[PDB]
């Protein structure tokens, strides 16, 4: 099960550390799993009953967070899964929140634009009475956007009687959102890839970067990569294939070509290559910003990069890590690596607890920041341990979750 | 499944009366299920997590109501289906209240009172979000009493800030609880058991009655039917054995053995014989109140008995129901029958909400008053349709829950 | 000090029963005491503060019961005493309520109506804190009355968002009162006078009463036992003096005599006597409704009372009790003769619960019905220990109120 | 009485000043003193009562601010009177609380560390009713920690039913602290060090410093003094005796060895001496943070010091108090010397509130700026009366919190 | 009617730019509008009951944000005018609050002091239904202050049952009132009138300014302009005349004069003029901080300043608009220029929120920050449309109100 294994990876980093048997049993069970059959009322007049999740499994450091997921292929095991991730994810970069998730199983290509919204009204109704803002804090995911998140944050405050935008992140801008929320993950990826720099001390200015993938984290990622580090972002790719050069791609064309056209992909001034491929270049740092397992057995073995950035989830396999620790190639953790998300979003739930909102600069700044600390907190466990960078990611996090249930009673 | 066999029986009757399909799959799925993983800590000091059940099917009618359970084996399977029960359960009765059952998979005999009483106090403080004396009304069950049911009551008050006495029924009558509690089932079957004559135009006098078990459920109807209808009790047996006697059995001599004795078998002047000879008897009225499928197949054919009170949970199968129809012996649905039960918790909670308590006349006679009525309306019913009583009284709970449902959008 | 001596009281039956150590603390302390200092502006223009007290003893059966007093010598200890019977005579009763008790070291008579209805609101703002109609139900007591009580009502209203009218008991009829509120002490006294007449063998056509005082509970009583009971009334006494007349007074003519003149002495067709020699008369029943000791010592041996009903508050004491005992004298414990008072303000918070009101008829049937209960449970006890009917139904009293605290946990 | 002579030194300023009478008189007592009485089931098994208090003196600036103390010798008496405190000591550093304290009667060192937690949740459940974050807000005190700390807030939040955090301050770090807590009072004697010598025109880099006593508050004040402030700590003393030396001590040194030893003394390179001589010590700063009444008669006749900043509470008796002024010798009032602490639990609840925290070197400025207006402010009353700074102090108290009150009716 | 002549000029807006015919409806009407007639007691002891409104027109971007007024003549018309424009105001401004107002049908100068107060408890605790922290933030208008906001703010607090602080602006500073309230709209002005000298790239020092009035903007305006801008103001005017000086004024001089006299007139070193006059002055820049209407179709062709910054509420009609914008003379809109007083507020109700004050320069640079951007993003808005500058500013508010309410559902 989905669930089980990412037990399993808890497990290890357990007996790693003198961890309590009787606590590691209660971090590992999620404390709050409600499900629910609700109605939405189509507009052909016919009713029709649709499932939802929400999953708070520790809520020990704080609030309950963790986004939604609209997909026909929803299971429990899989809500329950992420939101045990969300707990580490979040202790690991040090924010007073818990983990949360949540999902509906239905296909937001097949309901219309009325239907969505009701049916995201009649959900975020029904999951009410275990949100709040300082009991779950939910976000958006996979099929969900600003545009819904808004629609969940209007529906509370419609529900409790007052105004409230702080018991969903990820809202517009101009409605409580927070600057920088885009460019968040990519920019989280940015200071890592400089800091992998640093410990294997590449100079970032003739440092070569390779992309796999280029959707929101790998656009941002390679732009701020190349402007902010001067690094240069040799190749990237798309799910169709990818370009290369050892000259450097012009990351702001890039962009606008993949939003001129579908893909990278023709771009000239490009040598045409496999995604696979790309990710055996010969670069210093490997940004797997794709899809998972990217990086496995077969590859493991030829990969050329000296540190992998994981922009993506999962896309190296254990296998893989295996592997690349023992050829010591430094894998930084997805669960540090593209928390910059997440960051943000801590960010606009404070501003919007104030009502006070920050400028770009100021995000930018704390997103940074605090990004730079995880990464040093996650080095220093790492060296006590003698472990994978991820594995030690994972101690940290188990660690600081287990001192506050401990103080807690 | 369990729970997808309690549809299936659901199914038959919504294919009897003309539902509307996208309504029906409303009244099929479950509106909450609340599963809790919480910590107790044991006399021992260490911590031991234990797996927690809520279900409100439906709230349609009036806040959810149903019982807990205390089992090593439950599984949220089992409490479904029992919760998806309740809702036709009370609605045949005509009371207020929804659909709703919870569980703890645990053994009360490997703990300790006091680890018992922890564990019942945080279940009841983790499922608190979604029970209320206006949404949810959990009561006693398998391997849960008054004394545990008192500490539920105790807990939410002390959490609320106040006194609420109406949190939870079956409490202990110098704390809100209800007289006529106990003898509540049997005077139920006892109702039953004389309407089960008078349709017949079988005179009480003279009737005779045998019933398979001895439980709260079996002495209780045997001693009021003998006493209140003047019906003799040729015959009762227990997990052992049972006796005969066409003279009829003294029902309070017969009880005080059974409580000086394990057994009612060796009890003198009663003709010994095994519980399906007891079932074969020839008696106008076979009470059933053991266990299930106790009238089969090969029994079916064979039972002389003119009327079926079924005092236990299913003890007729389906296979018996069809035969016994087709004999035209009349067998009275438990989800009526037994319902006595759920029908004094009504009147507790009603008390509750008051403040005010009434004597044992006013509730014996409100129980039968009312049982009165739910008899005569799935016979109606009954007759519109031409059908097993079961059925009848199947249809009557499901339509009367759709008009609600209807009615509120 | 007064509260210690309650305490005392409460020890010597606590060791007649097996009561638990652990457990006797509990019940001896009180739960909670707030104590208040609250300005209130004058009509001169300065301001005045006053210190105000609220104990609630226990609440274990239910909501504190209690009056408050406005009074220029209250200390927190007549305070805490005060609550801490409460807390058995509401036990006695069997009424779902539990200990409390209130007042303002103030002096009414110094206040302009005005300044009075100001303090009281004030008052009730500060001590609002820890009541409810589900928490403390306050109610009149020395020098407040149903106006008092009123604004009391209405302030709380006005705090909480919505009419109450059941955050106190003894409201103006129109208003959330209850009829019969008058009789009531009195009606209590008559239903005890007469059973006292019964365990005696009495016939109550024959038999004669005294009664030392005519207060509301004087009055009432003696009018009710003449009229309802029979029993010719040869005696009452003012706070002046006593007449006497073996033909018995016409109570109804008696009354009005002492509405039109001060006192009942003078009056025609009425042998004159003290107030001491009342007490001294030859009388089948004797119902002190005056003053506290009363009967003592120097008394004691020389009443002629087969029976004393205690109208009034303490007026026999613990000496006479001995004696008395020892005599073979039947002496009914105020807490449970006095206590119909307490009991039709029960009805009251229930008539306002579900804010339908019942007719005196109904009052009467309930506050005589219970009465009756009361009496025979004490004397049930009474055999059981073979002790002082005051003493049973002091064990009574613990006993009920230790079983709910034993069941909470 | 402890209450009365706190009352005492307040008239004394009021007096000072034109202070309503009428209004003087709320401004002394309390608002509310609330007294409960809890039972607690020790290890054994059997049961045992606590007394518990929580006073609220004044709430008009802002909630009630205080902390609670475990103390087998704690009177009401104590507890008022140092809410009477509070509620000067916050109103001097300008901070939008009240004036609360609380405490209960228990000897810490005689209870299990489950029995002491037990206990800690069942008072803090039973003044819950009084308290909130908007309300009163409970802090340690003597013997109580953030470990106690921790279970009060964790306890609300399951009460309240949603993490709080901001209910009580002294959290442990990783659970809602504030960085700079443990310094905080020491760095408020260093800021007042400081201005007390820029007053009296003596360059810090070349005064001379003792401190009396080697706490929290006197390590640290020695400390920061040290290094910030570049004056030399020529002594210092444990609950032995003292060390001097015109050389100056390593503070830092001083400390270790204070922590690898019980006390100070011993330590080489320090001539030893009593406590009394460390007074008397020709020193330009006398840091007094040890005992009550250090500086009494006797002493003050003798002191050399030029200004005494009072790390402790109350080191300084009236008489001494007189004869220093007299003498011409600057004493810095307690309630604004050591009130660090107090500020810095303000800037923990201010984070609480938005749930963001701030560093340590924001904590730092923070409390150095508000400390030094504080202490400026202080100076302008006292030459605007031309008194003792500590009556400067408490009038510009009273005058705030009157303004507050006559401004709000 | 007042109102519909509001509505008249957003149609205007409404027309030139693309809004949904439906939706342009919905932002037309207003949501809330609550009519009371509460009863106060008198000082000669009769009751008077007093008739009270207050309306939130939108509440889309925020919590509805506005005024109270006290005035014999009040009508439901003139309070929904007013929130109507709140509406527009705050959105001009970006601030999180929507549209609301309120008033009272009384005259302050007939009523006492006490009476007075009274009357605003009552009315705040007859609106409070609707109003809130985060529903509707009322704040001072015409006839009521910051002691009457103070009434307001205890009584809401004391009728929540805590300190909120933040239900009401304008409040005294030691109050929770922000510093820089006062100079809050000239500072505004100020800002604006600084920028207007910039799009005509007339420099500050040499310039020249007028301003009719001296009130609270008056003062405060010019004072600034003159210290912060270098700008001279050659004239300003009272109720009474105006003066005039090439030279430039002492504004300084100029307040302590109208402070000691009751006009500016007289005041030696200045041409007494008319306040006509005044308008038709040959300055650089007009700041209208008086009356409406000043500036009229026959003044209109008469203006020779090159700018006119609108200190007042419409002191130019429609017609003077016309002209003006064909004569090429900018308008700064009243709805932007003396916003500062409403963005000030907004600041005081966040530093409430997190209970942390912000000293002077923080709201001074705040103030002007926001100030810059409004004025700016009317520009952007007035370039897009070629229209005249007030109505950019009308637009962008519909603007973005109707994004939030479109992005709302």
């Not at 490009?270 to 998972?292: M, S």
Request: glycine share 10%.
């Amino acid at each position: 099960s989905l669930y089980e294994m990412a037990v399993e990876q808890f497990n290890r980093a357990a007996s790693l550390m003198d961890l309590e048997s009787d606590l590691a049993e209660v971090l590992r069970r999620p404390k709050r799993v409600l499900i629910v059959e609700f109605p939405v009322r189509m507009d052909d007049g016919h009713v029709e009953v649709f499932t939802g999740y929400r999953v708070q499994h520790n809520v020990a450091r704080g609030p309950a967070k963790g986004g939604i997921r609209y997909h026909p292929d929803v299971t429990l095991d899989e809500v329950k899964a992420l939101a045990f991730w969300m707990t580490w994810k979040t202790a690991v970069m040090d924010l007073p929140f818990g983990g949360g998730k949540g999902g509906v199983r239905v296909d937001p290509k097949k309901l219309s634009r009325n239907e969505l919204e009701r049916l995201s009204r009649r959900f975020f109704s029904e999951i009410q009475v275990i949100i709040g803002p300082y009991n779950d804090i939910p976000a958006p995911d996979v099929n969900t956007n600003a545009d819904v998140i808004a629609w969940y944050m209007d529906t509370y405050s419609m529900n409790v009687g007052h105004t409230v935008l702080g018991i969903v992140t990820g809202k517009p801008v101009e409605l409580g959102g927070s600057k920088g929320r885009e460019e968040a993950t990519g920019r989280g990826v940015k200071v890592c890839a400089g800091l992998a720099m640093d410990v294997l001390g590449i100079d970032p200015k003739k440092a070569t970067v390779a992309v796999q993938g280029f959707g929101n984290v790998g656009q941002f990622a390679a732009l701020l990569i190349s402007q902010e580090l001067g690094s240069k972002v040799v190749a990237v790719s798309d799910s169709r294939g990818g370009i290369y050069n050892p000259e450097g791609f012009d990351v702001e064309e890039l962009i606008r070509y993949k939003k001129e056209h579908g893909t990278v992909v023709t771009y000239p001034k490009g040598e045409r290559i496999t995604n696979e491929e790309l990710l055996e270049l010969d670069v210093d740092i490997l940004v797997p910003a794709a899809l998972e397992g990217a990086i496995h057995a077969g590859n493991a073995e030829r990969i050329k990069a000296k540190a992998v950035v994981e922009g993506a989830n999962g896309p190296t396999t254990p296998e893989a890590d295996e592997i690349l620790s023992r050829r010591g190639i430094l894998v930084v953790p997805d669960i540090l690596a593209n928390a910059g998300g997440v960051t943000v979003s801590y960010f606009e739930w404070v501003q919007d607890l104030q009502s006070f909102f920050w400028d770009l600069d100021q995000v930018r700044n704390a997103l940074e920041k605090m990004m730079k600390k995880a990464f040093n907190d996650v080095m220093k466990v790492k060296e006590k341990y003698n472990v994978d960078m991820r594995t030690a990611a994972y101690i940290l996090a188990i660690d600081r979750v287990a001192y506050a249930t401990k103080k807690r009673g």
